[PDB]
Amino acid sequence: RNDFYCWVCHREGQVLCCELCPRVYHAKCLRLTSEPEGDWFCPECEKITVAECIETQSKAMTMLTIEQLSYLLKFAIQKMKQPGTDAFQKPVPLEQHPDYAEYIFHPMDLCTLEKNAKKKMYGCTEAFLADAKWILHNCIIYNGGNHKLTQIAKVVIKICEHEMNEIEVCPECYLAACQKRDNWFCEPCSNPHPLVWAKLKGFPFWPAKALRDKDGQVDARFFGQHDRAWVPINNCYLMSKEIPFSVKKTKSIFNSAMQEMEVYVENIRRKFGVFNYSPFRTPYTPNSQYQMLLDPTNPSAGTAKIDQEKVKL
Ligand SMILES: [Zn+2]
Ligand SMILES: [Zn+2]
Ligand SMILES: [Zn+2]
């Protein structure tokens, strides 16, 4: 049953209908080349389609069954359900809001979202976020964009977006960080993240995992603190024995980071049999293979084939 309120701006008016879902849109809100002719699927349905196509699913999704994704969405829900989100934890009751269904054609709340996830209804992170966004749309429609509840619903969505992004960067990292087992940061992932010296401007060189490469920036997760930052690629070296010296305020904190990295290297050598340190100041390059080479003096031989286990995660 189609919505009356634009998915983008949350206002009524003349609105286009999606063929696949009940969302509607002002044409003007979509900034189109021209209005659609007939077969039209909205930006949410389009995203979901691209994300759920096996050939073009993310690295994260290729890693994961629908049931494994559902486990991770359960962790995301628990972050969304934090103290102060009470108003959104259960369906809106008609007792308190007798006219709710006159405005809100697709109710949603955190308990429904959680149940849906447990039932394996979501095929990708995009689909989970698209559904959670009904909570904010509905809040704005019914209560108004400047209502205090809208602040809360906005934070719930920003949390969801954050958690979905983390799943997509690396589902194995995400699960490890969620469960916080003993030395969780020292567990190598199935396609292990290269270790780098990473220098954020104004910060000392520090050991990190390189999680992804986007246009000249590296997404680095630092040993010790386990914080993150985009780092310019030319400020990232492959891990080496020789340390790029920086003046630092606390030696003990840097020591704890190096110790953690040492355990990680022991663990990767156990898991894959290899870890190659680089000559000092060797530039990190995207999708770096160096550390996983069987013979680092013979890069054409690549990484060793030992493998055909189903439980890769
Ligand atoms: Zn609009
Ligand atoms: Zn749609
Ligand atoms: Zn990972």
Author numbering: 86 to 392, 394 to 399
Task: Pull verbatim passages from the article behind this deposition.
To better understand how multivalent interactions involving more than two reader domains impact recognition of PTMs, affecting protein function, we studied the topology of the N-terminal triple reader domain architecture found in the zinc-finger MYND domain-containing protein 8 (ZMYND8), which contains, in addition to a PHD/BRD arrangement, a Pro-Trp-Trp-Pro (PWWP) domain within a PHD/BRD/PWWP cassette. ZMYND8 has been previously found to participate in transcriptional regulation complexes (Eberl et al., 2013, Havugimana et al., 2012, Kloet et al., 2015, Malovannaya et al., 2011), is implicated in gene silencing (Poleshko et al., 2010), acts as a DNA damage response element (Gong et al., 2015), and has recently been proposed to control, together with KDM5C, enhancer activity (Shen et al., 2016). Here, we resolve the crystal structure of the triple reader module (PHD-BRD-PWWP) of ZMYND8, which forms a stable unit capable of simultaneously recognizing multiple histone PTMs while presenting a charged platform for association with DNA. Here we report the structure of the triple N-terminal reader modules found in ZMYND8, which form a stable ensemble capable of simultaneously engaging histones and DNA.
The 1.7-Å crystal structure showed that the PHD domain packs next to the BRD domain, whereas a zinc-finger motif linked the PHD/BRD and PWWP modules. ZMYND8 contains the conserved asparagine responsible for Kac peptide docking onto BRD modules (Filippakopoulos et al., 2012), a feature missing in the ZMYND11 BRD, which, instead, contains a tyrosine residue and was not found to recognize Kac (Wang et al., 2014, Wen et al., 2014). The distribution of charge on the surface of the ZMYND8 structure revealed highly charged patches as well as a large hydrophobic area on the back of the PWWP domain. A C-terminal extension necessary for expression of the three protein modules packed onto this hydrophobic area of the PWWP domain, inserting bulky hydrophobic residues (F360, Y362, F365, and Y369) into pockets formed on the PWWP surface. The interactions of the C-terminal extension with the PWWP domain explain the necessity for its presence, conferring stability to the triple reader modules. In addition, an aromatic cage (residues F288, W291, and F307) similar to ZMYND11 was found to be present, suggesting potential binding to methylated peptides. Intriguingly, the C-terminal tail of a crystallographic neighbor was found to be inserted into the cavity of the PWWP cage. Superimposition of the mouse ZMYND11/histone 3 trimethyl lysine 36 (H3K36me3) complex established that the C-terminal tail residue K396 of ZMYND8 mimics H3K36me3 insertion within the cage, suggesting that ZMYND8 may be able to bind to unmodified lysine residues.
